[PDB]
From a paper:
[name] is a homodimeric half-transporter composed of a transmembrane domain (TMD) and a cytoplasmic nucleotide-binding domain (NBD) with an N-terminal TMD (TMD0). Here we report that, in addition to its well-known role as a peptide translocator, [name] exhibits an ATP-dependent phosphatidylserine floppase activity that is the possible cause of its high basal ATPase activity and of the lack of coupling between ATP hydrolysis and peptide efflux. Here, we present the cryo-EM structures of mouse [name] lacking the N-terminal TMD0 in (i) phospholipid-bound, (ii) both CHS- and 9-mer peptide-bound, and (iii) ADP·[name]-bound states at 3.2–4.0 Å resolutions.
The structure represents the typical outward-facing shape of ABC transporters, in which the two NBDs come close together and the TM helices have a very wide opening towards the lysosomal lumen (~36 Å in the longest diameter), while they are tightly packed on the cytosolic side. We did not observe any density corresponding to lipids or peptides, indicating that both substrates are exported from ΔTMD0 prior to ATP hydrolysis. In the dimer interface, T286, S287, T290, D294, and Q298 on TM 7 interact electrostatically to stabilize the outward-facing conformation. Consequently, the central cavity is completely isolated from solvent, thus probably preventing the expelled substrate from re-entering. In the NBD region, the two ADP·[name] molecules are sandwiched between the two NBDs. The α- and β-phosphates of ADP and [name] interact with the Walker A motif and Q-loop from one NBD and the ABC signature motif of the other NBD.
Numbering used by the authors:
A (entry chain B), B (entry chain A): 168 to 739
The structure:
Amino acid sequence: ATLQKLLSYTKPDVAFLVAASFFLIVAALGETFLPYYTGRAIDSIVIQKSMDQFTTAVVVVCLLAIGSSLAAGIRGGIFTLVFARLNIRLRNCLFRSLVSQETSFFDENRTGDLISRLTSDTTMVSDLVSQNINIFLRNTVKVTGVVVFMFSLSWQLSLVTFMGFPIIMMVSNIYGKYYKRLSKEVQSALARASTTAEETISAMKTVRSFANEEEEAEVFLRKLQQVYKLNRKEAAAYMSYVWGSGLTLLVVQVSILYYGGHLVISGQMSSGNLIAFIIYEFVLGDCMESVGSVYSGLMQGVGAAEKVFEFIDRQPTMVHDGSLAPDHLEGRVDFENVTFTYRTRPHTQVLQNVSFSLSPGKVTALVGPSGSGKSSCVNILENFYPLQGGRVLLDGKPIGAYDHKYLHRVISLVSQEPVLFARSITDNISYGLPTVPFEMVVEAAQKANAHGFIMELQDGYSTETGEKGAQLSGGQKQRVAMARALVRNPPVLILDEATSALDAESEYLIQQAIHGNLQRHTVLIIAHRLSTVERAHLIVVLDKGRVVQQGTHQQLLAQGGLYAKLVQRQML
Amino acid sequence: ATLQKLLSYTKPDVAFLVAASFFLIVAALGETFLPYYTGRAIDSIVIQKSMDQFTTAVVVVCLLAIGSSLAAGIRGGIFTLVFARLNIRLRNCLFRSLVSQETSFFDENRTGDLISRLTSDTTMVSDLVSQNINIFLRNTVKVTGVVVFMFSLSWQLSLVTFMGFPIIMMVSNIYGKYYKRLSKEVQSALARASTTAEETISAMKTVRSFANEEEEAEVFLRKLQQVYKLNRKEAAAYMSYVWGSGLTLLVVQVSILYYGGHLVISGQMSSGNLIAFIIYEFVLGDCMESVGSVYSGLMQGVGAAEKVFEFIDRQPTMVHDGSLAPDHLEGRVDFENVTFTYRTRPHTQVLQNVSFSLSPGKVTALVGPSGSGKSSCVNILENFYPLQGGRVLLDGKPIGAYDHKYLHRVISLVSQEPVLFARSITDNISYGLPTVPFEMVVEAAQKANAHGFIMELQDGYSTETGEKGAQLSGGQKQRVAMARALVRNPPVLILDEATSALDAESEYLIQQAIHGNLQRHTVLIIAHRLSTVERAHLIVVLDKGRVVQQGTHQQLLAQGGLYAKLVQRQML
Ligand SMILES: Nc1ncnc2c1ncn2[C@@H]1O[C@H](COP(=O)(O)OP(=O)(O)O)[C@@H](O)[C@H]1O
Ligand SMILES: Nc1ncnc2c1ncn2[C@@H]1O[C@H](COP(=O)(O)OP(=O)(O)O)[C@@H](O)[C@H]1O
Ligand code: BEF
Ligand code: BEF
Ligand SMILES: [Mg+2]
Ligand SMILES: [Mg+2]
């Protein structure tokens, strides 16, 4: 990220910066002409008396005071309304581009980092670019009103004052280019300190079962002391700067004296060579500010926003473009010679030449020895990850060709460890849908057998299950995750191992009777119990990522194909 | 939180502040005396030849310039250092008091709120305090100088200049009591929009299975447009305080003319009356800054830190004070007429008069109908929540009387949904322990039947399982959550649902063998499968929070007690 780019996100704020600059000029006139009009007013009363021409002249002293404060106020009241509008736009423009990246991206960036860039960084970058544009607009007017006088007093001497500027910028640039490399290693070393404060608070019930809850507060400290060594290095590099300029503004302050002598004796007056200094002390208090800091800050902002400007430009490595949304779907899924391997461990192949299909209207189970690729057959059916070789078909057309917002409304899912949100229940069984009538939420909460325990909570369908449904039992959090996938009435239904993983051994049956036997679905039951997969219309045993057997329970329990060995210890 | 409290947290910086103030005094002295010596040197060099006589006077100008530059640089450096130190101290002192609160606390405050608070509020408070202290010191020095110069001219008029200061303060106190009530409803409405950006990023694999990943980015926006409506009322005020001040500083400039002229025609030189204004213009620019902003800011800091100063003073409602660490623990647990009720739903009793015990060296199981209180018998045994009637005894003495860091080293636990951390595996099977030898991590990873699949990962025991072990299968995250509980040799082991959860029924046994049959443990197997509790030395069936049956498998399958009805559907 260069300096031009950072100033591009402030383009829609020109209508505000001009009205903020104009009201800045008017604030300068009233600050200079005031004395000239004051004496002109004091002489009036001094001529004869007051109350006769005083009011005639004292008026122009009031209007300037009033006419001034209005400007100095309406200005400060807009450079605080452009630090917000620039913030809200830098924040929103990141999220909206941080929530459309392929899923393989959230496995490499810990959710503590991604929030330290959205919360902290975009607050810094917004801050710097406000002040340093609040200043460079003030010091570009004072330098003008003070530069014209340094000519009226001297035509020669002024041309020497302007020989330091090109010097006070070669220095104000050497730090701008070093203050960036640093203010990026502080926003970074400050995020790594905010991924240990989020990983320890979100898991406080498992960091306390072990007694090191007060020792995980000394791994946070030792993460700040590394954001300190980066702060006592950002001071020594700002002290060392003030000296770098101050010295330079001295040489120009001396050389102006000696060369100011030759004139004072021969050419220039002695009264002028003294006033051209007072008016000269300002161009130093400006040549060091106007372009000393305004170009360091603008180079410390571009440092803080060096990463925030990378998540906004990153191109998702899996783009979904297709609008094949039909109106009559059968529900026939097929895996045609699949081959898969994750992006965070690319030396092991998860699936290999897997090939099977689900028939429309039948409960095709899927089993395996707890380490084969079973869920990975769900993280693909739902187009989370890309394939190396092969294609998944849904009714004859590869899933890549369906409308990304429609495919996920005809393929429900019950992930292995269901994750609920911190809302009500009636607002959690209808998560993805716009305003479904409260009638269909109950008609779909009796199928999953939730209405039994929901109508006993302190508040019924309006209770709360906060922070990943951690305020519901392990068995109630599924029957509320089941109902969340049935209220859509989906043709294809996917029940991952959370089907009945944590039920009472009598509840999982009262669901099977109603899940797909009554209506027409295409279920896909992944599980380890022999009960659930007993009556399945089919079974696909896969081991180490290779489909082995495809046969019904008895038709497969006859021959020994690694299936009859699994259910052995369970048949008692 | 008053202002004295906010300032108290900067007590250990008195040394730095006195050093900064001293260097500020020096810088002011230099900047004020420079022109007089400059004129002296110019006169001394113009009187005679300046070639050799100039230096004897320009040396003083050079020394004053060098001194001023050094002072300004050191002041800037020390203020940046003080800001950094204050920020670090506040940050650290928040966490260390935010990770020792009772567990119920973390069930009422969402983990996005806490992190937004910590980060943003600490940054804002430190920034405000630093800027404001700096400005106040500078302005007090300048005001002292100018007030001396003003008294030197008039003894009467000055006493009218100060008649406005109390006015410009009573006004700078009404935008310090309204600007606090506001800057607290911005930090408390900007952290309510950083819990919708953390709840959506940490659950990105379940907010995408439903297609509303780009509609969850328009619930974030509408959470910012309410931080705007506040950031606007915060501008329309600052723009309405400069006016309330600028005006008051006008009446003082008018009233200083009427009384200013009356003295110029009778007893005050007209030359002086003109000069007592220029010096007067640069007190309005200070009486409006020195106490204008420096007392609004200090009242906006106390606003932003209105909550951060509440998590630092909150008293944990469950304090553990007991040191009874023995050297020979038997391992006998007992529940003596327990009665329990959560604090976030205090109208339903979870447990009721529960009473049972675990015998030292026996696998006491525990079962129920998926909604009774079973885990709540573990969130109590580990002293997470307080009881209401009854005691939980560990070897005769209540658990409340054990070293909180020792009790949790003799009672291991396997939560219902295990949660791993984003580290290696050899650094995750030894979480709570300091540097256990790598020989004991393998000897304890073969018991849990994990060494089989660990030595096939791309990197072996050094691979990574990031962000809640989401980069391991559902059945590999259990066998790594067991090894984490067995590497301590706990005399009391608790398996909420670890083996039965997601194991393939083959490695399901190899754990069931070596866990407690070889050594001396006191296991407690919670589960739903008939396999675990089949060979258990005891069973305790509890329903709706009331222990019903306490008998072995056969001794309990004889009499129908809601047990024979549970395992019925699975006995095949
Ligand atoms: N997000 C992921 N990134 C990398 N590897 C993964 C990820 N999820 C699972 N794996 C690996 O894939 C293999 C098979 O995983 P998975 O298909 O989930 O097994 P199961 O379906 O039995 O849970 C496992 O060895 C696991 O280490
Ligand atoms: N943290 C919590 N806060 C409030 N209520 C809870 C919490 N955890 C569980 N519950 C409630 O307690 C009841 C019993 O929960 P629990 O004992 O966990 O059941 P199980 O042991 O079968 O999972 C449930 O109805 C559940 O709603
Ligand atoms: F390891 Be699994 F999700 F059966
Ligand atoms: F509802 Be549970 F944890 F058996
Ligand atoms: Mg799975
Ligand atoms: Mg439980």
